[PDB]
């Protein structure tokens, strides 16, 4: 009762960390098409860019390490010689949380190189 009740309570705060990367990444996506190649935006359009790239790095490192602690805890209670429905419920929420985190974080890995590979 106590260990799975803390596991459901910590996911409701991490869904706030998942929405907080996809809103900050949607702002970088309006900035990076006028400025990667600046033919028209601002002077220091860069005046805000040291804020948005250092903001996604601080939350992304806070969330990515709570996602490894769920994958690290399944492989440590599997190897004990166990077969239970509480173990299998834990991989059901991890595969929905890591699939929505890869669609935005694997897209953000291509966003920093697409700023300066072409710089069109």
Curated annotation (Swiss-Prot):
PTM remark: Phosphorylated by CK2. (Microbial infection) Targeted and hydrolyzed by C.botulinum neurotoxin type C (BoNT/C), which hydrolyzes the 253-Lys-|-Ala-254 bond. Cleavage inhibits neurotransmitter release.
Residues included from the entire protein: 27 to 146 of 288
Similarity comment: family membership: Belongs to the syntaxin family.
Source organism, top-level taxon: Eukaryota
Tissue expression profile of the protein: Expressed predominantly in cerebral cortex, hippocampus, cerebellum, adrenal medulla and retina with weak expression detected in non-neuronal tissues.
Record's protein name: Syntaxin-1A
GO cellular component: acrosomal vesicle; actomyosin; axon; endomembrane system; glutamatergic synapse; membrane; neuron projection; nuclear membrane
Main location: membrane
Key words, A-Z: Cell membrane, Coiled coil, Cytoplasmic vesicle, Exocytosis, Isopeptide bond, Membrane, Neurotransmitter transport, Phosphoprotein, Synapse, Synaptosome, Transmembrane, Transmembrane helix, Transport, Ubl conjugation
Signal peptide residues on this chain, from the entry's feature table: none
Function according to Swiss-Prot or TrEMBL: Plays an essential role in hormone and neurotransmitter calcium-dependent exocytosis and endocytosis. Part of the SNARE (Soluble NSF Attachment Receptor) complex composed of SNAP25, STX1A and VAMP2 which mediates the fusion of synaptic vesicles with the presynaptic plasma membrane. STX1A and SNAP25 are localized on the plasma membrane while VAMP2 resides in synaptic vesicles. The pairing of the three SNAREs from the N-terminal SNARE motifs to the C-terminal anchors leads to the formation of the SNARE complex, which brings membranes into close proximity and results in final fusion.
Residue ranges of coiled coil: 42-83
The keyword Cell membrane appears for this protein: yes
Gene Ontology molecular function: any one: transmembrane transporter binding
Residues recorded as bearing Phosphoserine in the entry: 38, 69
Compartments, as annotated in UniProt: Cytoplasmic vesicle, Secretory vesicle, Synaptic vesicle membrane; Cell membrane; Synapse, Synaptosome
GO BP field: calcium-ion regulated exocytosis; exocytosis; hormone secretion; insulin secretion; intracellular protein transport; modulation of excitatory postsynaptic potential; neurotransmitter transport; positive regulation of calcium ion-dependent exocytosis
Assembly information from the UniProt record: Part of the SNARE core complex containing SNAP25, VAMP2 and STX1A; this complex constitutes the basic catalytic machinery of the complex neurotransmitter release apparatus. The SNARE complex interacts with CPLX1. Interacts with STXBP1. The interaction with STXBP1 promotes assembly of the SNARE complex. Interacts (via C-terminus) with KCNB1 (via C-terminus); the interaction increases in a calcium-dependent manner and induces a pore-independent enhancement of exocytosis in neuroendocrine cells, chromaffin cells, pancreatic beta cells and from the soma of dorsal root ganglia (DRG) neurons.
């Amino acid at each position: 009762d106590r260990f799975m009740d803390e596991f459901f309570e910590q996911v409701e705060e991490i869904r706030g960390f998942i929405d907080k990367i996809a809103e900050n990444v949607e702002e970088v996506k309006r900035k990076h098409s006028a400025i990667l190649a600046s033919p028209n935006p601002d002077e220091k359009t860069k005046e805000e860019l040291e804020e948005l790239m250092s903001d996604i790095k601080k939350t992304a490192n806070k969330v990515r390490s709570k996602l490894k602690s769920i994958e690290q805890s399944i492989e440590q209670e599997e190897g004990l010689n166990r077969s239970s429905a509480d173990l299998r419920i834990r991989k059901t929420q991890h595969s929905t949380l890591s699939r929505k985190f890869v669609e935005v974080m694997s897209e953000y890995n291509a966003t920093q190189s697409d700023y300066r590979e072409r710089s069109k």
